[PDB]
Every structure is written in structure tokens, then in C-alpha cells.
Amino acid sequence: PFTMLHIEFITDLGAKVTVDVESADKLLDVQRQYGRLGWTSGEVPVGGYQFPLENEPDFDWSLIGARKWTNPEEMILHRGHAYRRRELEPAAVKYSRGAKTDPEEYVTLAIFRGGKRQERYAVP
Amino acid sequence: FTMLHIEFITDLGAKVTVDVESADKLLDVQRQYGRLGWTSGEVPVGGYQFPLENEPDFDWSLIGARKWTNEMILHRGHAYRRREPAAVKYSRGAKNYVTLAIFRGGKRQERYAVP
Amino acid sequence: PFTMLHIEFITDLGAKVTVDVESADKLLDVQRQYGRLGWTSGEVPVGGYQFPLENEPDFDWSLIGARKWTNPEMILHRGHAYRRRELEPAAVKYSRGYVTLAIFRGGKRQERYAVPG
Amino acid sequence: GIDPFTMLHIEFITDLGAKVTVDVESADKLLDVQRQYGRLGWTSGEVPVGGYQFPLENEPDFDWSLIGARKWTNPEGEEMILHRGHAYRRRELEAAAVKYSRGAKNTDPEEYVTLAIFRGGKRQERYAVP
Amino acid sequence: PFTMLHIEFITDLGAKVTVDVESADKLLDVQRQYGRLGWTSGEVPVGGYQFPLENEPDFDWSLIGARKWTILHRGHAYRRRELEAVKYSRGAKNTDPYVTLAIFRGGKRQERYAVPG
């Protein structure tokens, strides 16, 4: 009746678009839907997002407006940027790129370490 | 008709605004999404300032925090330790000391407590 | 029909809350209402607010989320305390340890700024 | 291409520095709302670096309430433009332009700062006083 | 009682105006409409927008509030340059923290980015 949510995006054209959501349990569906187009919401936290380690092999990258993509090398595309996969030995997996256009030798998109697995982060 | 609206940053960093029916329900909605790790607004320079008598039973979900023993306070993938007019401080020290909350002075406020 | 206004506050808990208003002539009522709770809207302008001189003795401090408070007479605004100062045009200022909250000088009196009565 | 049935919303900063957003029925009523609250001294958005840019043929009868300003003659006898507790003086520029600006101070990070420049362009009637 | 979209613009008078949109498939029409008036949405990404290379000869500049002028964007003028990719950039300025607008390079050509018809 008035139990509505609103999510604010930045689009592929850089436009500032807010999308209405019917209720709380439909929020993630909306996030994947517009993330599939390359739209993002909010800023990347300093040092990149932090996710559980057991969520790495099947993480839905559309939750943050990213997609997998292969070169003449398997990469992750996020805002006309490409991130490479790294292994750290607790175990961890980082996704980074070279700095510089350099708002303060590497800047990370996401780090997978520790924590307990969360199902909602996985590809349905 | 007329409502209220509160703006959050979620666990996925998303910018989500939540509708509220009326003023007497703002805190209920704050505790609710605070329990999920959602925050609203910025931490004031020098940390929040609460009355001294509100320390032993402060509802940390009001600011998106949770107690966690390894006894620490988790607020955004950050951990704060307890430290001791008298006063109590919750702090750390990184590179991006920085305090989350200070309890000192003031008269008590029952709305700040765990229901 | 299409006559709503929306005012954005920062609460006592630092939360970011926007309040709906029925129409323009009910805006000040909403400002005093949430102002008494300590909620503020917007930023304090550099050099403090500027009000007419004849509005000093009876200014509604709730219009900016402030309140009178005497310790063993101050103005409380966000866990900060401002002291009263005089100057001799004749101007009254509220200062603390210098950063100012409000300066009262010149101008013609404005009725809506006074405590209702 | 204007849609008759979709609402708009405009965000102001008031005389008390409060953040207030105003609802508008449709696109064709936006200007009416801008003049109304502009006459009270409310502003929307920031002054673009180097000041606003308007067509030259709009200077003699520009509605200053469109940006929350007003004309004001002062004790010394000079005609000024008031915008947010600031006063701007009228200057002319011969090759042709017209400039409204004031001296810069300490509490102002970039010596002059300008409010509006009238130069070139073709006339637009919506900028004029009704 | 339905679910819409909302797009936030900065106008020709610098005002902050948000426009309602009926549904997702009508967003583009709204963008072209107010873009034709010089309204923009969001900020120009550092290093400028990035498009597919095959979208250059018939790009609808109204999608970002620009217009052809034998490119005008925000009272600024940008010149065409070739790379051997196509670059649109202007000189420096004493009022900005070469600065490029759009860069066409690689990628697969996209439907909607073209002037309709």
C-alpha cells in the first residue's frame, strides 16, 4: 500500500535512474535484472567488496553490474574496466587492475575470504 | 497521503530508500534494516555521542552494528574494541585512531536501549 | 492534488530521513516540530546564519534544531554549546571554541521567526 | 514531445538553508514553480563556474527570480542584484557582452566571481518577465 | 498503485529536476527528449564515455545532451580526432580540476545508440 522500496542506479549512459520496487523480497530480482545491463548502484567500497570464500566459483556478477569476458584470458568487466583473477595463500581470491584517473600500484574490485556461504549471492 | 522516507546503504553497497508510514515507526524500521547491516548517513567526526548511562545495553542495530566475540563491535567489515568525567570508547586504528562511539555525560534515553 | 513538499533531515541518531509535507503553508510547522527533537536540515552557512537584528530577543531556536540551556545561558546545537556575544552597528553573535552559529544584524523584522504567541 | 500525465520534482535550498523538494504536476508548469519559490529567495542547483550563460537580447528584461535573485538599489544610490546575501554589480563588455559580478573574499574558494554573463545567442521569451 | 522509474537531470538553468517515467521501455524516449533541450544526467566518466567503434558515424548526441555544430556540450566545444578509434576532446581550462568527451573504440555496434530512422 505504501511499503515500497526505491533503488538508485547509474546507467550505461551515465544517467541517474531510480527504480521502484514493490517490496523487500523483490529487491534482488531487480538488482540482477538491471545489473545484467551494466547498471550499478552505490560506490565500490575501499579495498573492494567483501564476500565469503565459498562464494567464489559461482558468484552472480550481475549483482554488481559486472560480467565475465574472454580475450585473445578470462576477465571481469566492470564499467569499461577489466579485472584479472588472483590467488592468495586463510585462502583468498582477489580481482584487481593497475592504478591510473587515479583517485587514491593496484585497485581491487572484489575479495573472497573467510565467512560462511550465502546462497543469494549465487547464480540462480 | 503523507509519509517518511529513510535512505540506506546496503550490504552490497546499494543505495536503497525505504518508505515509512509515520513518525512513530521510524525506529522500528531502523532496527529492522540495521539488523541486516544496513546503515543510514555518515559516522560523525569523532564518532557518535551517547549518554553515559546508555552503554551497558545499547541497541547496536540502531547504527547497523553487531556484537561479535573472537568481545568486539562489527561495523562495516571493521572491528572496534572497548576502552575505558568517566567515559567509554569504541575504537580502532587503520589507514583510509578512529572512533565509532563515545559514551559520556547526558541523561539516559530509553529509546536507545534493546527492547 | 499535486501540491506536496518534501524536507530532508539529519536525525539525532544521524539518520537520513525525508518528511512529507501537505502544502507550502504547513512547512514551518513541520520544521519547528522536528526541530524540537534536535533534527536539522541542510548545512550551517559559512559564517553562520544571518537574521534581522530585531529578531534576537525572541528567536525560535527550534527552527534550526537548537535549544536554550543554562549550566552552573547557552545555545545547544548538535552536542555543541554556543556563548552569547555583543558588539558596539549593534550586533549580537553566538560563538564557540572561532566558529559562529548565528549573527543578528540589520534587516527588517520577520514575524515567522519568532516563538508563536 | 512533452508528456501531459507525468509528474516532476524540483529540489531547493531555502532561506533557512533547509533542503526542500517541490512536486510539479507536469513539465508545462515547471517554470511557474521556479518563479514562485525563486521570488522567496530559494535556489536550485549550483551556479556554474564562470556564472550562468544567457543570450544577449535577454539582458534588459531578465526575470531574476528564475535563479532566486532580485534587483536592489542601495544607500549610496547604486542598483544591484542580490543573490544569497551577496551583491553583484553591472558591467559592460565591448568587443558585446554584459556581466554581473563582485569582488572575491576569503570565505570563497575559486579576483572576481561572476553570477551571470549575457553574450551572443538568440532570444528566448521564457527567460523574460511576464 | 504501480512501479515507475525516475531520472534526475541538471537543466539549462542549472536546476535539479527529476522526471517520472512510466516503465523501462520508455526511458530512452525521455532521455532523447530532454537531451535535445540540453539537459544532462549524471557525470561524464573520467576519460570520457566509451562506446563501440561502429557507432560513431550516426551517434545520437542527444542521449548525453549534446548537439552538432559545424560538438556542443555544456557551453563547451569539442573537436573530432582520429586514432591510428575516434576521439572527441577540447583544450584545457583554468576551471577544471586535454579533457576528452567520448571515445569510440572496439566493441560490437549497438542498436539503440543510433539516431532513429
Swiss-Prot record, chain A:
Q: Which UniProt keywords apply?
A: DNA damage, DNA repair, DNA-binding, Stress response
Please list the GO biological process terms of this entry. Answer: DNA repair
What the record says about the induction of its expression is:
Induced to high levels following extreme ionizing radiation exposure. Also highly induced in response to desiccation stress.
Disulfide links within the chain = none
Any one GO molecular function term: single-stranded DNA binding
Reported function: ssDNA-binding protein that probably contributes to the ionizing radiation resistance of D.geothermalis. Plays a role in DNA repair and genome reconstitution, in a RecA-independent process, and is necessary for recovery from severe genomic fragmentation as a result of exposure to severe levels of ionizing radiation. Binds single-stranded DNA but not duplex DNA.
Supply the domain comment. Answer: Contains a novel ssDNA-binding fold, which is structurally and topologically distinct from the OB-fold universally found in standard SSB proteins. The disordered C-terminus of DdrB may mediate interactions with other proteins important for DNA damage recovery.
Known partners and oligomeric status = Homopentamer; arranged in a ring-structure.
- Protein name according to UniProt: Single-stranded DNA-binding protein DdrB
Please tell me the species this chain comes from: Deinococcus geothermalis (strain DSM 11300 / CIP 105573 / AG-3a)
Provide the organism lineage as a comma list.
Bacteria, Thermotogati, Deinococcota, Deinococci, Deinococcales
Full-sequence range covered: 1 to 143 of 178
UniProtKB/Swiss-Prot annotation, chain B:
- Which GO terms of type biological process are on file? DNA repair
Its Gene Ontology molecular function terms? single-stranded DNA binding
List the keywords (alphabetical).
DNA damage, DNA repair, DNA-binding, Stress response
Expression triggers: Induced to high levels following extreme ionizing radiation exposure. Also highly induced in response to desiccation stress.
Entry text on domains: Contains a novel ssDNA-binding fold, which is structurally and topologically distinct from the OB-fold universally found in standard SSB proteins. The disordered C-terminus of DdrB may mediate interactions with other proteins important for DNA damage recovery.
Q: What does this protein do?
A: ssDNA-binding protein that probably contributes to the ionizing radiation resistance of D.geothermalis. Plays a role in DNA repair and genome reconstitution, in a RecA-independent process, and is necessary for recovery from severe genomic fragmentation as a result of exposure to severe levels of ionizing radiation. Binds single-stranded DNA but not duplex DNA.
**Assembly:** Homopentamer; arranged in a ring-structure.
Name of protein: Single-stranded DNA-binding protein DdrB
Protein encoded by which gene = ddrB
UniProtKB/Swiss-Prot annotation, chain C:
Write the record's keywords in alphabetical order, separated by commas: DNA damage, DNA repair, DNA-binding, Stress response
Where in the sequence is the signal peptide annotated? none
Q: What induces it?
A: Induced to high levels following extreme ionizing radiation exposure. Also highly induced in response to desiccation stress.
Sample GO molecular function, one term: single-stranded DNA binding
| Gene Ontology process terms (BP) | DNA repair
What does the function comment of this entry state?
ssDNA-binding protein that probably contributes to the ionizing radiation resistance of D.geothermalis. Plays a role in DNA repair and genome reconstitution, in a RecA-independent process, and is necessary for recovery from severe genomic fragmentation as a result of exposure to severe levels of ionizing radiation. Binds single-stranded DNA but not duplex DNA.
* Domain remark in the UniProt entry: Contains a novel ssDNA-binding fold, which is structurally and topologically distinct from the OB-fold universally found in standard SSB proteins. The disordered C-terminus of DdrB may mediate interactions with other proteins important for DNA damage recovery.
> Subunit info?
Homopentamer; arranged in a ring-structure.
Descriptive protein name: Single-stranded DNA-binding protein DdrB
Lineage runs: Bacteria, Thermotogati, Deinococcota, Deinococci, Deinococcales
Q: Provide the gene name from the record.
A: ddrB
